[PDB]
Design a protein around this nucleic acid. Structure first.
Ligand SMILES: Nc1ncnc2c1ncn2[C@@H]1O[C@H](CSCC[C@H](N)C(=O)O)[C@@H](O)[C@H]1O
Length: 327
DNA sequence: GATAGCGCTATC
DNA sequence: TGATAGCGCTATC
């Protein structure tokens, strides 16, 4: 994550819905904003969250009275995505875990925050002929909010991860925000191998499988993209080996495969999966952030989390627009 | 809960 | 296409 000297969100209050690890909090907090409420129902996520913010998020958002949520200026929410991801069954809103956005929709109805910040996977952008994104857009307009939506890839914001996500920035129409803009991409100068841990710390992660089949020669030069080198088994999810010289693939929350949730990488001749801490770095989390004691949960948490840095550049720009109030 | 084979999708 | 990749799914122990 990046250091932000000029705090654009000082004095502003924000809610952390579907908090997970607190990625949205890490980001807005770096911009000066203050967290007044967090929500997350996963026992384990609540555990890590506390382990890092000394607070315990509140359970099932679908049973919390909106009127109960603290007043706030910015609603952050990277709601569930299993129901919209390229990787899953795409049952969209029909999916039990897919209606959560309407839970946000009604929080906003009550609290009427100055800004609604949301995040989800790229496929949500076009899911079901783009009708999903459209309901969200109209549902937001009908609450009296503008709807700024764009798909950014982490690799375009200082983080070596091919994580493409759709970010939705909604401003209350009353405030007349017109100069909002999404961060401009900038050259990726960091790669997977720059974030790796020393071999001695990742030995236990090394995987040696007879079905290891290297299909591509390691790359000498760093690149702003994922470069597959080899594969194990049938090369399915979590069975693909990539170049540390390139960028990492998308961390997943439920992903399987021998390299479950992180993907395989080639480090000093050995083939291995990433370490939870490496995921953290891959997600833009500061090493000072405490990962969950359970590697599996830790991986899941980082898997469906967000890249802080990206969240920062957006958050900072959110403040700019918010603060630009000439006479 | 943790591990891991998968199998079908979107994209150009 | 043909090749690549995905905050996933779910069976098993
Ligand atoms: N009804 C509900 N109430 C609270 N949290 C819920 C929920 N349904 C799903 N979730 C939570 O939704 C989160 C979606 S992933 C969001 C991750 C988060 N922005 C981060 O940076 O970690 C998960 O942590 C999941 O456990």
């Amino acid at each position: 994550m990046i250091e932000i000297k000029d705090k654009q969100l000082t004095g502003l209050r924000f809610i952390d819905l579907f908090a997970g690890l607190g990625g949205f909090r890490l980001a807005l907090e770096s911009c000066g904003a203050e967290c007044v409420y967090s929500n997350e129902w996963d026992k384990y996520a609540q555990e890590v969250y506390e382990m890092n913010f000394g607070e315990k998020p509140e359970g099932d958002i679908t049973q919390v009275n909106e009127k109960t949520i603290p007043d706030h200026d910015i609603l952050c929410a990277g709601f569930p995505c299993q129901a919209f991801s390229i990787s899953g069954k795409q049952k969209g809103f029909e999916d039990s875990r897919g209606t959560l956005f309407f839970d946000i929709a009604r929080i906003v109805r009550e609290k009427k925050p100055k800004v609604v910040f949301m995040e989800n996977v790229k496929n949500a952008a076009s899911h079901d002929n783009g009708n999903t994104l459209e309901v969200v857009k109209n549902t937001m307009n009908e609450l009296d909010y503008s709807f700024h939506a764009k798909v950014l890839n982490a690799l375009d914001y200082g983080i070596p991860q091919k994580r493409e996500r759709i970010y939705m920035i909604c401003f209350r129409n009353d405030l007349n925000i017109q100069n909002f803009q999404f961060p401009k991409p900038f050259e990726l100068n960091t790669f997977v191998k720059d974030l790796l841990l020393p071999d001695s710390e990742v030995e236990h992660l090394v995987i040696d499988r007879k079905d290891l089949v290297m299909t591509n020669q390691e790359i000498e030069q760093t690149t702003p993209k994922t470069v597959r080198l080899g594969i194990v088994g049938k090369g399915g999810q979590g069975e693909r080996i990539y170049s540390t010289r390139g960028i990492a693939i998308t961390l997943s929350a439920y992903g399987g495969g021998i390299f479950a949730k992180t993907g395989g990488y080639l480090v000093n001749g050995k083939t291995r999966k990433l370490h939870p801490r490496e995921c953290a770095r891959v997600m833009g989390y500061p090493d000072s952030y405490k990962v969950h004691p359970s590697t599996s949960q830790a991986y899941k948490q980082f898997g469906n989390s967000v890249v802080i840095n990206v969240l920062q550049y957006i958050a900072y720009n959110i403040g700019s627009s918010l603060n630009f109030k000439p006479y």
